[PDB]
Every structure is written in structure tokens, then in C-alpha cells.
Amino acid sequence: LLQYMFVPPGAPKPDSRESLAWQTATNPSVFVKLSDPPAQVSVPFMSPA
Amino acid sequence: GDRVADVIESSIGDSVSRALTHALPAPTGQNTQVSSHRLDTGKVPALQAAEIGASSNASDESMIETRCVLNSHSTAETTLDSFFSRAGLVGEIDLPLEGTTNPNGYANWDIDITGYAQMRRKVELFTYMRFDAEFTFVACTPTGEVVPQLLQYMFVPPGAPKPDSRESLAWQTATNPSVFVKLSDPPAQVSVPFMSPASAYQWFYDGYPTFGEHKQEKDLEYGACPNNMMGTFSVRTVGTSKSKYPLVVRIYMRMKHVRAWIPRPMRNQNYLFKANPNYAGNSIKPTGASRTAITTL
Amino acid sequence: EIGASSNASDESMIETRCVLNSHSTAETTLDSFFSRAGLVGEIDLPLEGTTNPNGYANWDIDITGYAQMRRKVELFTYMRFDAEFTFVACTPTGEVVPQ
Amino acid sequence: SHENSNSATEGSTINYTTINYYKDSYAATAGKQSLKQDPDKFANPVKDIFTEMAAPLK
Amino acid sequence: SHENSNSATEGSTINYTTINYYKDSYAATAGKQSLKQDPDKFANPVKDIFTEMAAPLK
Amino acid sequence: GFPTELKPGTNQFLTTDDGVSAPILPNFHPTPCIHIPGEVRNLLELCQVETILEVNNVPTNATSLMERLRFPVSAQAGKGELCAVFRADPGRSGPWQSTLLGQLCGYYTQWSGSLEVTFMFTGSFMATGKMLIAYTPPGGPLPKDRATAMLGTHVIWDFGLQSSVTLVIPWISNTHYRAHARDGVFDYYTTGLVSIWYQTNYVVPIGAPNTAYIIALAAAQKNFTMQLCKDASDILQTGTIQ
Amino acid sequence: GFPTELKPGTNQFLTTDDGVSAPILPNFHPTPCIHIPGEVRNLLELCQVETILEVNNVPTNATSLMERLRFPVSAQAGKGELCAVFRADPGRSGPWQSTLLGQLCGYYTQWSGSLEVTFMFTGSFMATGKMLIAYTPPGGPLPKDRATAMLGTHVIWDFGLQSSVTLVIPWISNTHYRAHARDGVFDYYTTGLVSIWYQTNYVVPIGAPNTAYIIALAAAQKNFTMQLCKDASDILQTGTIQ
Amino acid sequence: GFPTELKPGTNQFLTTDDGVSAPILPNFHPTPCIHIPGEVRNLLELCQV
Amino acid sequence: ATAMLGTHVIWDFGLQSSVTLVIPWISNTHYRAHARDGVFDYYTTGLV
Amino acid sequence: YSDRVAQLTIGNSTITTQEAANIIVGYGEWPSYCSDSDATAVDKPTRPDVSVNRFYTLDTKLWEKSSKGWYWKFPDVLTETGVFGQNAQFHYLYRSGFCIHVQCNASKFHQGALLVAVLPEYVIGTVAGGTGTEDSHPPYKQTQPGADGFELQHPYVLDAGIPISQLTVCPHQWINLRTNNCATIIVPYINALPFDSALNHCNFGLLVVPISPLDYDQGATPVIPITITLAPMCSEFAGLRQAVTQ
Numbered sequence A: 001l002l003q004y005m006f007v008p009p010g011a012p013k014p015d016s017r018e019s020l021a022w023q024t025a026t027n028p029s030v031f032v033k034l035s036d037p038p039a040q041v042s043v044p045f046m047s048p049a
Numbered sequence B: 001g002d003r004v005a006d007v008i009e010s011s012i013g014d015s016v017s018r019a020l021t022h023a024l025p026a027p028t029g030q031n032t033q034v035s036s037h038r039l040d041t042g043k044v045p046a047l048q049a050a051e052i053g054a055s056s057n058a059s060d061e062s063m064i065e066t067r068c069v070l071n072s073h074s075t076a077e078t079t080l081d082s083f084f085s086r087a088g089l090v091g092e093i094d095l096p097l098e099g100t101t102n103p104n105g106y107a108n109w110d111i112d113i114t115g116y117a118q119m120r121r122k123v124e125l126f127t128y129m130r131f132d133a134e135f136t137f138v139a140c141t142p143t144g145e146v147v148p149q150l151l152q153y154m155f156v157p158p159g160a161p162k163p164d165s166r167e168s169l170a171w172q173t174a175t176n177p178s179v180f181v182k183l184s185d186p187p188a189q190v191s192v193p194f195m196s197p198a199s200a201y202q203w204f205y206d207g208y209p210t211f212g213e214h215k216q217e218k219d220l221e222y223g224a225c226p227n228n229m230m231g232t233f234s235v236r237t238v239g240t241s242k243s244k245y246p247l248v249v250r251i252y253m254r255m256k257h258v259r260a261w262i263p264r265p266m267r268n269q270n271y272l273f274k275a276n277p278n279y280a281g282n283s284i285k286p287t288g289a290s291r292t293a294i295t296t297l
Numbered sequence C: 001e002i003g004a005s006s007n008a009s010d011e012s013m014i015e016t017r018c019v020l021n022s023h024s025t026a027e028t029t030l031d032s033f034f035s036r037a038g039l040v041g042e043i044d045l046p047l048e049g050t051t052n053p054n055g056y057a058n059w060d061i062d063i064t065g066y067a068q069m070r071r072k073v074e075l076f077t078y079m080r081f082d083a084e085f086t087f088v089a090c091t092p093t094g095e096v097v098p099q
Numbered sequence D, E: 001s002h003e004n005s006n007s008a009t010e011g012s013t014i015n016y017t018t019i020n021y022y023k024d025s026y027a028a029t030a031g032k033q034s035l036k037q038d039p040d041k042f043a044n045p046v047k048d049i050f051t052e053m054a055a056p057l058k
Numbered sequence F, G: 001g002f003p004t005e006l007k008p009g010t011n012q013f014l015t016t017d018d019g020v021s022a023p024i025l026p027n028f029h030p031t032p033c034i035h036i037p038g039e040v041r042n043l044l045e046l047c048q049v050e051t052i053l054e055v056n057n058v059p060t061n062a063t064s065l066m067e068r069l070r071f072p073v074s075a076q077a078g079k080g081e082l083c084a085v086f087r088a089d090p091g092r093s094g095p096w097q098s099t100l101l102g103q104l105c106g107y108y109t110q111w112s113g114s115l116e117v118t119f120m121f122t123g124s125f126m127a128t129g130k131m132l133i134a135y136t137p138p139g140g141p142l143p144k145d146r147a148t149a150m151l152g153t154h155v156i157w158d159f160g161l162q163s164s165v166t167l168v169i170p171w172i173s174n175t176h177y178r179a180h181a182r183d184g185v186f187d188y189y190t191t192g193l194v195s196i197w198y199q200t201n202y203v204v205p206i207g208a209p210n211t212a213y214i215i216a217l218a219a220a221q222k223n224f225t226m227q228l229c230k231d232a233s234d235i236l237q238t239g240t241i242q
Numbered sequence H: 001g002f003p004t005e006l007k008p009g010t011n012q013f014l015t016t017d018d019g020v021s022a023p024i025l026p027n028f029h030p031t032p033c034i035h036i037p038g039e040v041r042n043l044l045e046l047c048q049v
Numbered sequence I: 001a002t003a004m005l006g007t008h009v010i011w012d013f014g015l016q017s018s019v020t021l022v023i024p025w026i027s028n029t030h031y032r033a034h035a036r037d038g039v040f041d042y043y044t045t046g047l048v
Numbered sequence J: 001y002s003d004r005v006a007q008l009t010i011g012n013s014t015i016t017t018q019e020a021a022n023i024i025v026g027y028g029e030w031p032s033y034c035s036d037s038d039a040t041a042v043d044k045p046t047r048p049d050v051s052v053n054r055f056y057t058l059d060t061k062l063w064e065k066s067s068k069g070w071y072w073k074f075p076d077v078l079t080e081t082g083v084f085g086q087n088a089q090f091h092y093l094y095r096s097g098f099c100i101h102v103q104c105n106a107s108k109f110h111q112g113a114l115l116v117a118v119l120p121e122y123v124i125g126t127v128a129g130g131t132g133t134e135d136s137h138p139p140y141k142q143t144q145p146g147a148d149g150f151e152l153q154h155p156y157v158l159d160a161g162i163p164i165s166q167l168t169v170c171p172h173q174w175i176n177l178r179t180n181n182c183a184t185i186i187v188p189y190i191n192a193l194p195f196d197s198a199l200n201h202c203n204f205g206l207l208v209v210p211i212s213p214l215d216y217d218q219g220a221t222p223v224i225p226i227t228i229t230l231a232p233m234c235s236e237f238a239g240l241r242q243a244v245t246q
């Protein structure tokens, strides 16, 4: 059971396998099993330019 | 005359809350009109009195010659729904084979959103909040392995019989909601309505829930509003013989249809306990980083 | 003695204010009170025991035999309803097996 | 009578447009929201407002 | 002739609005229900009702 | 085929979910529903029906159990002696637990509205008497004496042709709803205390009993509603049936 | 049944996905929402509310922490001495980290718009003084002297009946939005530097203090918006709660 | 629920399939697209150069 | 603390030198005879 | 017309001031009586009006050159004071907003600035044994100080983990000695309930705390007192019983 987490610029980067940042109270994260088919996500254009 | 005048005129019982301000639509950020130089006496925007208690009304058009800007930056990302519709960790339930913790494949968790700082501080920004919820339950082994086990999550509202055994009679669930999931299946997800007796949940109850004398005994019940104590949460194995695998259940809460009310300053000290704003007294930290001198960077 | 309940309203027992009550009574209906799945049967198929040992069990359908679902139902004498049955299968440890 | 009206935000000023499949409307999506603000409620809750151009204390 | 009418509550006073996918209507949801009550059936099944203001035994 | 994604929640079995499922019997028709007297449509219809309030609590000795349904009231040779007293909380233990409202409340976590407790005097016709019956809202202790009892909601009851007076204990709460008040921190949702004093005396002529009994019936008013479905507070099974 | 294909993404749990899921409580109705004063509808409503800008940074000695909320300003016996200076970057450490805007900015990666920093003078009424307050846009170093400081956006502040002047630091960026400028390569999104000089002097009569304090309040203008949701820059937990 | 059969092809990840998938950012709005000189709309525009 | 419980006025020293305390006609009778100084305290007006 | 000269008359009370800031209306919302659609109790409430709706002078702290600041918890401040507190004791349910007039005046050769703030649901935390390993709770005299109020343990942290660095969110008003000499805050009934106990629950907390310290030369006045005055508005009481206290 994996957890992919998107960490936008300035957000707390995980420094451990069990870091406190894995609570994901705001920044997007996905919980997938390897049994499940590939996780797929749509992403908007998010540059300041 | 008849009747008395000080009753006729009297505004006693006036129902509607007199609004000093109405809300205007702001889909885009405010546009900026063009500005020119101004050398006058009497018209002075920059000078203000903070004593009043109001924020600076001085607009940038009157502090610097400005161009025209058709601002179409959306303010949608900064709404209570789109700020709180983020599933965060609110609970971790452990079911080890043999340990100090629950060893019989039945754990009870009195539902407390706090106990996890990130989801807490974000929520603690407001004093009163009213919302529906979307709960997700992730089950696995302490290594993250997926195993063929069958759990039973059961919602036990206040007053309902709490399970005292892995094979308790309360697991018949004739009325109170329960969910039957395999660990093979994807995370169970459930929508939850706003079920407080009050119009909103409170993250802060400045008082006691009981009457009488408040000696040093019943002093720990200070700050305990039962209106946002929505009962306990129970997990099964299921029975009847003990499980074969170590299990971990993580609860995630997503808020929808959110309506917070009065704003609150934002925690700057380490959370230490659930439903209790205590803090380490000798380890008092500044709200932010600090530098060596005010004249250096 | 008559056999009727108190017709006395609170407006005539105490000076009362106006209350626009909008509390819903939907939660207290026979459908929303009985649309709760409860335990009504447990069928055992052990490998070898006193109970059924050949992987075939017969259960004459009896809602009772489980107090919680029973007492809730026993509130009324006559009931008429459609039903939605769910069958949960596993091992005595709760393990899922390819059977 | 349409469907159930048991959303937490029922009867509010806010105009939501949401998606739902079940009879209970609180199980619906967060959905699209109406963008209305009122900064003066918190930023300027004074009784007698003076103009931007005006000297507040006089 | 529309669909089957084999719900247990068929032909009753109650007005249900339910969801269904199969031809047999008894496989439908519990659905939304009409809120009607009749307390007097059990709470006041007397023959000659007297007023609230009245003395019952006279 | 038609593109679909499976959201979290699949394969789960929510016991209270109102979905559909496959039918075992194609074209089966239920036997026509004939008329049956006294149909129930809403549980509030039953909650307005009065039932015995067991204010007298004495298990001694499982033979004198029928005494639990009545008050002892007698010719007090004093003034304003306390007769009886009990909690107004319906879902709490234990006098309300004999009432149909009490058990039906046991299937719901939240309630709201006024309640009615009707007291029937079962003395002789020759027996007379006036008694105060006080409802003291949340806060405040057991009224030590009658003088500091009447300060709340009360009714003066005169014994006569009409056996029963009804004390309406109006919905007095801070919240719109009350969860069950039991029995520590959850006292926040208490309804209060009902006490019974002698306004004057239980007065009897020469040839009639010096002691009589009072029966208390209880139900909910018409502004009564219930909101959240819980399991019964007590499960009646030990350990396996049959 | 109806032909369907499962696209990649099934069984995944996206924590920010706005889908629906099964309801636990059929026909449950939330208790009616009474009126509560001061409802928040958009976080920008709170971002326009001014809060203390901690420009003075001294942890010494965790008892003199309250000094962090104010400037020292005194009767300089010179010309145009530097008073104080700080970064205009709101999401960066550290003076803006005391403001409500600073923390709310900590929940967003991108922002845009003008900002306002209001300075209140807390000296005696007898104390007077004029001071320059300069905003130097990105590029350019700390202004070594006042003469090469005024070359940017600045305001001349006169002490008087109105305690506070407000320096509006207008939205001056190349991009439409600014990510948090911290602290190496991401200096691309810096907002600039705010410095405070003595325009003339802090002048006092005979019987009044030679040293006074200035309080700086900060908030966002009305052309302010935020765009991308991140976690809080600092998590407040070590290591387990309760 | 609504009766469905799964046709062959489920759980497959076709790298060129133009389907939809879940969005990470609710109500995110891309920064407005200013004017940039010389936009390409079709690769044939470059093939004539 | 046990003085303010009656009719009172908070006076701030400033540009206007004088505040005026209006002691309103608070009597049971329509008129007051002179209150001096024993039994005739019935007609007292009070204390400032 | 002027902005700094104000007069506040409620019931038989009257406050004058010549050196003030404008009046703050709390959350931009005037205090009001409870509608028949928000209320839930069926009792006909008492609205005593003039007798209880009036100014009360309850405390006067001495602002010394090194003070951490004080606070009061509403409406526990009046519970033993006047005929307001009498109604709050004999009754179970209570509803009111307040008109707080904090006042403190000095010379023109004094300096310093107070921060008057009304923080709803001001829950107070304890120093957790200095180290953080003790789930202790505040005594009754700290959470419900009443008349005399309570001095802050630490002012930076607001004795609750929250920073005073951003207290100016909730309705506030500065008392800066060189401009104003009094603050005035009008709050409505701020609660998720139409009524509450008034003894058990405290709707909000008044936080009077200096940020820029009081200072003065060797002049002829070192005793500078801050005085707290408040006045209940649109007061309602329901659920009558015997007299009950703390």
C-alpha cells in the first residue's frame, strides 16, 4: 500500500518514512494498492507565468 | 394615555440583527483604476488612527500613481469549502497481535478530531464550524501490507452500547451504522451529516459542562462541550477466533458544505493534549523565526 | 380513568413565547427506523465438530434468536414489509479465503 | 417534494450547484460555490465610517 | 402498463418517491416518505371528546 | 465499454445504506393488504401515549415489584413534607425506563420538546388534599424545602372529581436538542428535577384509610421530535438464544 | 448489464477529490442553523484584517518576548540614521510570521496583490517627528543610506493627532503571482525590502521620554488573491498528542 | 445498484487514450494567459518553414 | 462598586470643563415637602 | 459633529468622553433580541430592560510600568453584581450582548498603548508542568475570576497556545495614551445557541493588555489606573428556578 503525495513549493518535505507531514491536511496525496490498476490524476496549469 | 407610551415606542423584542454591513460579490480580485498626482490640503488618505480598531482604508491608487489593471484573479481557491475539502489524518487505530495496546481485535475510539496537529490547526482558525463530512478508512498491516482480513467499523453514537468484547452482543448493529470491509477492497468511504444539537461545532468551550462546585477533582472537565462529542468508534476482527494478522486503521476526514463563523488567532505552540490548549511553560517559542539585529536581514 | 392521554397543552400551563418549530419527524418513521440492517442469523460450517461437518447447513428462517433486531421488531404485533438480505462469509478468524 | 433537504448549508445565502446520487442531500459534492465577500465585517466594524480622504480623529 | 406494482406498500395512503432499476418495484429503495401523523388514534380514542378547557368527568 | 472509475467505498457493506439489490422472485405479487385497525405511521404517534412512570424503585423482593408503579401518600402530621422526587430526563435511568417513551427514546440519541407527567390519585372519594408539584430546570440542587421549590415551574393539584392533574414540563433547554443525560460529563443535557410536596395535607374522615397511592403516567407533548438512531441502551440476551 | 470499462485510477483514494459517498443516516435533519454574528465566507475577508508585524526579533530571554511587537525609536543626535528594516515577503521568515496574513499565506503557495503595513507611534503627545519609510522593489541591495533609499516607493510620515501612517507596498512583480520566496533559488519571487529612516528627528520637550516605541500592523489590500493549497510550512507536534 | 458488465480492457493503461481522471486542485484557476508572439497551432505551420 | 448601582454619570476632564449630573424626579409622592430632619425624612431626595 | 467626543446613555447610566476613538460594533452587527425562529425554549422570557441594561463599574487595575496584562470572562463578571446577576442566578437560560467601555487616562507627557480585545470562547490553558508532561487544568479562580479579574501567566502566548501577535482579528480597540483615553466595544450575543447558562458557559473574554509599556519621567503622577465598565444589552432570561451560584 503506497502513498503518493504532491508537495508544492514551500510545503513541508518528508524527512522520514513516518514523518508528520504525511497527515496531508491540505496538499494532495493518493492512496493506492499495487493490486489496484495504475493511479491516474488530472493536473491543471499552475505556473505563475 | 392608553396604553403607556414607554411600551408603545419601546424597541424591546426587536428580532432582526441590525446589519452594519452587507456582502458584495468578488469573483475576481479588485481591479485597479488609474491614478494621477495630487497636491491638496484636507484630503489625506495615508494618515489614519489604528486606535479606532479598523484596518487601513487607504487604497494604493491614492499612495502612488497607478496604471489600469483588469484583475481577473479568482478568489474561489480561498473559500471555506475549497479550503476544508482536503482529507486529513484524524485518527490511527491499532490492532496488534500482542502488546500493551488493544490485543483482542476490538478497539474503541471516542471521536476526537484533534490529536493530529496539521488537521487541528487548520480547523482551529475558527471558533464555530458547521459542516457535513466524508470519512475514509484505510486498513493495512504495520508494514503497509495488504492481507485477506474482514473488518467491521461501527459508529456508536452517545448513549449506545459500547463493545466490551471482540464478540460482544453489540455487534448485531440493529440500528447504529456499521460497515463491513475487506482489506482487499479499496478504502471504505462514508458521507456524514452535521449532527450537533447546537447550530455549530465548537473547537472551544470556555466553561464547565456540569453545575455545582468545581474543586480540583472535576477540574479536568473544563472545556468539555458534549455538543461536538459525537460518540465512539469501534472496530471488530471479525470474530470469533482471534485474527492472524496485525492491523492498522487510519481515519481521514473531508469536510463539505462548510460554514465557519468567528475567526480565531492561529496556534504557535506545540499541541500537547486532546481537547485541551495546554503548553510547555519553560519551552515557550516565538511565533516565527528570529534574526540577530533589526537593522540587518 | 377515561383511557386517554393528557390533552393539556403547554400554552395553557405556563405563559409561553412563540416558537416556529421546524424540527423534522422523518427520522421517526417506520421506514427510516427499520431500514437498518441487523444480525438475524449465523451459519457455521466447521471442518469437524458437533455442528454441521459436511459443508451443508440448513436454517429454518427465524428472524428472532438475536435480541437486538428482535426487540426492535417486537414493538409491533403485525408488520408488512419487503426485505433486503445480505450474506457475509468468512472464516472463524475473519480471514478471507478462496471458497 | 423533490428530494431531501438535509445539507448542512441548507437555507443559507450561499448558492451551491452540487452533484448528488442519493436521496439525502448532505451526501452531495462540495460543488461549485458563489463568490461573495464582506471584508468590512471584520476589517471595518466601526460605527461612524469616515472617508478614505478624511482625517479619522477630528 | 408502466412497470410492475408489487411493492409491499402498494395501494396505501402513503406517497413514496423511490429509485428502482429492476422491473419488480419491491426491489426499490426505501426512498423518501410522506410525513403524516395520527396521534389521536392511540392517544385519544374516546367516543365523546371534551375540550381541553373542559372538565372531563361531569 | 462506457469509461468508469471506481471511487473509494466500493465493495463496502453499509448496514444503513438505502440502495437497491436483485429480486429473487420475478413477477411475485404480495397478497392484497386488507384493512387492519390502528396502523402506526410515525413513532411520535406512540410517544404521545401515556404509560406508567416507575417513580417508586424497590426490587425488594422481586415479589413486591408491583409497588414500583405507585406513590405512597399519607396523612402527614406536619407541613409541606416532601412526598417524592425524580429526574425529568427521559433517556436516563431510571423512572422513565418503565415508560414507552423511555424505551423509544432509547432508540434515539437526541430529542426535543415538552413532556407531560400525569398523576392519578387512587385514594377514597372521601379523601381530599392539595399538593404542589414542582419542575426545577437545569442548574440548582434538590429543593431542600417547599418554599425554595416553588420558585420553578409548578402546579397546585386539588384532589376531587377529576383524579388526575398533569404537570407539563416545558421544553427548557439551551440547545435545540438534548442528548441522553447519563451520567457524568453528559449532565450538560439534563432536563431537571421533578419534586412533589404536600401543599396542605392528606385529609381523611373517620372510616377511611390513612394511606393512599398515586399513579404517575408519562408521555411526550406534540412539539416532540427525535433525531438520531442509536442501538438500545441495554441488550436483552445472555448468552445465546435457543 | 450495461457495458463498462475501468479506466486507470479506480480504487485510488485522492484526498482532495470532490466525489460523493454513502450516507450513514437516512432522513437525518441537521438542527436548524440559528444566527451567529460575524460569519466568514472567504479567507480574503480575514486577510484584510491588520495584525501585529513582529519586526523586532529577540528571543532573549523568552520573557522579553513581548518586545518583539514594537520598534525602539529615540532622539537620534544625528541625521537620517537607520531605524529598522525588514523583508516585504509575507510567506518568508520571519517578521510576517506573526501576522494572520502570514500564517494564512502559509496555507497557500501563490499570492498576488498589494500589501499594507500600518505603523502606529506610541510616544507621548508632546513627542513629534518626521520619518521616511521606503519600499525598495526586487533587485538592489539594502539601502546603505537614506539618500539612496528614497529612490524607491516611499512615504513621509509626520507624527501628530493621527498616530498611524500606512505604507502601501504596491504589487510590483514580473509574474502575475508570487510563490514563497525562501530562501535560495526561490528569491526570484521576492517582494523587496522595507526600510525605515529618520527624516528629521524624534524631538521631545523637557519632561517627556527620550525613547518611544512604534507598532507595525500588516494586512493585504483588496486586489489580493491566493491560488494554490499547500500544507503549513511548520507542523506543530512532537511527537504524539495525549 | 445499476447492472453493469465489465468488458475486456478494464484496468488497462493505454498511454494514448483520451479519457478523464480526478483533479488534484478544487477550484484552482490558471494564471491568465497574456499575449505571447508567434503561437503555434499546427505542426504543419512549422513544416512550411 | 456599590455606588454606581444608582443613577450615575462618568465624567471625563477635557476641553469642556463641566459635566452636569441630572438627578431626575424620583419620588413616590407628586410633591416633596422639606426633608428636615427626623420623621420628615419621608420626603428625602437621596444622596449624591 | 466630531468623532472623538462621545456619550453613552443606557438605562440610568451615562458615560462621557472627550478623547476617544470611534465606536466598534463588534462584528458589524448590532445586538438584538432572540427571534421566534432561532429560539427553542417554550418559556416566555423576562426582558427586565432598564434595571439590568445599564453600565457597571466592576474593577480598576493599576497599570504599572511592567505589567503583563489582565483579562475578564463574560458574563461571570456581573453574576454577583446588581439586579442583572440576580436574574442570571434565578434563571437557567440567559442572553445578552455587552457595551464594554475600558477607560484609562494620563497626561500628555505620559506614553504607552493598551490593547482592548473581545475574544469569544477564550479557553485558558495551563503551563504543562513547565516541561510539557502534565495534563493539569486551571482552577476555578483562573477560568472564572469574576470581579477582580486575572493577571496573565505569560502575555505573548495568550495562556492557550495562541499568539497575542494576532489578537486584533476579533473586535479590538487600542488605548494609545497620546491620542485616546478610552476604548468602547459593542458585542452582540455571540454563541451557537439562542440561550446559555451564564454561570457555566462564558460567551467571551475581555483582554486588556499593554504592548507598548507605560513610561513617564519623574513627574507628579505615577499611579495610572485602568477601569473596566460594561453594560448588558437586550437581556433575556428563561427557565426560572431557585437562586444558584458558582
Ligand SMILES: CCCCCCCCCCCCC/C=C/[C@H](O)[C@H](N)CO
Pocket (backbone or CB within 6 Å): B111, B112, B113, B114, B133, B135, B153, B154, B155, B177, B190, B192, B201, B202, B203, B204, B223, B224, B225, B228, B229, B230, B233, B275, B276, G024
Ligand atoms: C462511521 C463512523 C462515522 C463517525 C462520525 C463522527 C463525526 C464527528 C464530527 C466531528 C465532531 C467535532 C469533533 C470534536 C471536536 C474536538 O475534537 C474536541 N471536542 C475539542 O474539544
Ligand SMILES: CCCCCCCCCCCCC/C=C/[C@H](O)[C@H](N)CO
Pocket (backbone or CB within 6 Å): C061, C062, C063, C064, C083, C085, F024
Ligand atoms: C435467499 C434467501 C432469502 C430468505 C427469505 C426469507 C424471508 C423471510 C421474511 C421474514 C418472515 C418473518 C420471520 C419469522 C417470524 C419469527 O421469526 C417467528 N416466526 C416468531 O414466531
